[PDB]
Design a protein around this ligand. Structure first.
Ligand SMILES: NC(=[NH2+])NCCC[C@H](N)C(=O)O
Ligand SMILES: NC(=[NH2+])NCCC[C@H](N)C(=O)O
Ligand SMILES: NC(=[NH2+])NCCC[C@H](N)C(=O)O
Ligand SMILES: NC(=[NH2+])NCCC[C@H](N)C(=O)O
Ligand SMILES: NC(=[NH2+])NCCC[C@H](N)C(=O)O
Ligand SMILES: NC(=[NH2+])NCCC[C@H](N)C(=O)O
Lengths: 149, 154, 155, 149, 155, 149
DNA sequence: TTGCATAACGATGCAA
DNA sequence: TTGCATCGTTATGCAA
DNA sequence: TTGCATAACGATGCAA
DNA sequence: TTGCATCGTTATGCAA
DNA sequence: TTGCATAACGATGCAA
DNA sequence: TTGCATCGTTATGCAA
């Protein structure tokens, strides 16, 4: 559940990372992070945003683009609830376990939250390395994920 | 007819201990009905009959679940796939024997893995990239039929 | 007074009036003598690359055709960027049935494939990148060979 | 070469990570980690395990599932023999090189061995990062892999 | 004096003379009586596995057919290595249309697929590896089923 | 722009990592790292190298192979110019950001440069972890990449 | 216990 | 939709 | 602001 | 190449 | 040494 | 299975 402004920020973010051909598709992309709105609302959002359905010559039907921290943290905490199997740490690294295939998904949500204490993440398949920004330790990071769980 | 023979079968199974299809044939014959092993294989396949046994339990006997599950093994490979399709299938498209499923960025592997686990008879295999999954349809299913099958769970 | 001529009438009408719907462009062309249905306008605008434009809070757009000078701040160089990376990274092409197979230097397939996706080609249903190989699925009735030749001609 | 009990533990592990449609297929999966048995033996294993060939309605032919450290270390040492090109280290990380494409394969075998001194692994393509559990260092880890080689 | 016999003449002529071109092998076979065009020689050399060899700074090669004893230092065991890993890692095969689908243990698909690419099979247009699955695209008119059976027979 | 000898070393490297079926293809692979030569030159290179177009029985048309630090650093610096969005660090790790999909590409170029202070790299999608060799820190590595940029 | 050889069982392309 | 014929898959008697 | 119901608008398979 | 018929996609009047 | 233009060489769809 | 005709691929004479 997010307000007009929060939802639109997410829309802008979605439109840059995905090729969105229709408003129904945009609604599915938002529902994946727990934002449920109808098509009417998205028509209004995209208009307020100045989003245009852009295509070149012989370019088919078009995809929406809007011309020119994220918060953000809620998407992540949502996914942590769902995909975080375990945490552990060593030195400046937290190590997170997710179900198989889920690591890139969780890690991308972590990146987008832009935590001040996270230098970066790398996802394999069911594992994520989270690099702690000094002097934060991996143990503290792990503590932060266990708390936001 | 068919739907009626299958009712005879659901009934015979949950009241006797059938260990082979030929055995179910002779049982249905005594009750009047004449079908071959071929047809029983087809019916049990449609019914979702499974040959069951516990640890050291020998050759199983056929049982059809009543949407109440198998003992501890979740036949919700399918239920889990449907749930993740509901959460993550963004759109579908197709070409020839291929269905192409789109997901949010980074989620394709997670969905594709749930699809593999469900072991659909009409899927030969899947490949996940980052936001795209290619699903190969088993002849004579087309990519379009397979896509619509995934759409109807979206 | 054929197609290429009607499309010149259209480029002209658009950049001098404010057309908000295809039916509206139909009646405009009718006054100027020409009779075409909405179907045909949809096809022409698609070929012209006409886009319905508006700014922030700008309502229902009006049609405009770029003159290879871009859209305002949104780079219609999804295609230009794809062509540049094809130039840099497409090593060879091949095909089978509905599939084009593109080869790149080792490790570059994801980076190229991502630029192809962003370009959102009408004839591409999707792509999958491995490490040095990209599979591109052609939209019927385009064949993998036509799609490969299309990528070759940018190589 | 493993005994009835070791082989069956491996079978249970295989059945959860793969979709196994036939006993011949199960034999190939076991041969990949150097366990060679015949189909007769697998029929007997699967029976002792209570494994059932499960399918839903209109669900085709079925895949085997059994209802409800791994050792483990031998699978890994086997693969180390085969895929370990070099080791190196820095701080709390061992860095392992494998031939191209082999890294996920080796790393998954390392994960399943559940070494008490390994917090986790991440595989790229020909490289694996192994995170040492404090106070073990990466150098020691590298020493441990060079020993099990 | 059929195909298998002409190819024996060729294995013989090659390992006793220095043939630098197919036309050259044609005239050599003509002197020995046999009449074939360059087209046919190209086909035979292809089947024989004749390779045009030279060392460093060695110019235009001469044709040689290995006797299952390898090429000098370059392992023609791209194929041997693929067969070995197929034996180790191919768990099952299946097919659809122009695609063979190979299954491996979890995490091994890239390692197998890489060995298959290196072998550079004439009937493979390319491969894509996921985690436990590899998709192999058959070159028309080979089908996915033929390609799968070819991998099966090495399993 | 590289000399006969530098170009040929790159050729040898390319022929082992790719399946090269034709000289035109080899030219595209070299152009991707900014080396532009014609087919005539490559015919001469491959001859000097003793490269042969190798195939087995019924083996089709053949691929080129040559029988039996890289510098190297220039390929990398070129790509750094093009793909390095940002650098950051923690302890013994430098963290590099590239555009999406570009990480494996940049990282492989980093591996091939074989920098004495780099123990190894792992690439995700838009991120690379670079492991610094003790006592070099990640901050210094980051400084080195910011310099070669 | 295990392999082998083989029997019992189940699935499926084809034609009706 | 079914049966036939057949083939792939799984179970099991005996030797070791 | 939002959802709903529905109207307005655009795209496309088919047949000519 | 176009129009027809139709369907998918997007915009918007009203109740809350 | 390199590029260019072009010659020599090899591969392949098609029809017999 | 082959030859024809042709095209893609590789080698090389000359200018710079
Ligand atoms: N199926 C696999 N790729 N397994 C390898 C896992 C290795 C490591 N834990 C990672 O997630 O990167
Ligand atoms: N972050 C990325 N790699 N994006 C590119 C995606 C390319 C292609 N659609 C795939 O899924 O394989
Ligand atoms: N380094 C590797 N993973 N090589 C394997 C490549 C296999 C296949 N061509 C792909 O690109 O997916
Ligand atoms: N084919 C490649 N992507 N090679 C680059 C490997 C880069 C890095 N060492 C990794 O394994 O992730
Ligand atoms: N982590 C997994 N087990 N993924 C399984 C599904 C992935 C899909 N078959 C692929 O190879 O890309
Ligand atoms: N598109 C994605 N898979 N994003 C998740 C990966 C995020 C992480 N920084 C990495 O590159 O591994």
């Amino acid at each position: 559940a997010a307000n007009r402004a929060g939802r639109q920020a997410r829309i802008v973010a979605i439109l840059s990372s995905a090729q969105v051909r229709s408003q129904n598709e945009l609604a599915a992309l938002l529902a994946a992070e727990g934002i449920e709105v109808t098509q009417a609302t998205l028509s209004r959002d995209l208009e307020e945003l100045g989003a245009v359905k852009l295509r070149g010559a012989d370019g088919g039907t078009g995809i929406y683009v809007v011309p020119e921290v994220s918060g953000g943290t809620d998407r992540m905490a949502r996914l942590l609830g769902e995909l975080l199997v375990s945490t552990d740490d060593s030195g400046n690294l937290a190590v997170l376990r997710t179900p198989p295939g889920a690591a890139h998904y969780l890690a991308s949500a972590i990146d987008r939250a832009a935590l001040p204490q996270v230098v970066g993440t790398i996802a394999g398949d069911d594992t994520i390395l989270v690099v702690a920004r000094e002097p934060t330790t991996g143990a503290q990071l792990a503590g932060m994920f266990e708390n936001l769980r």
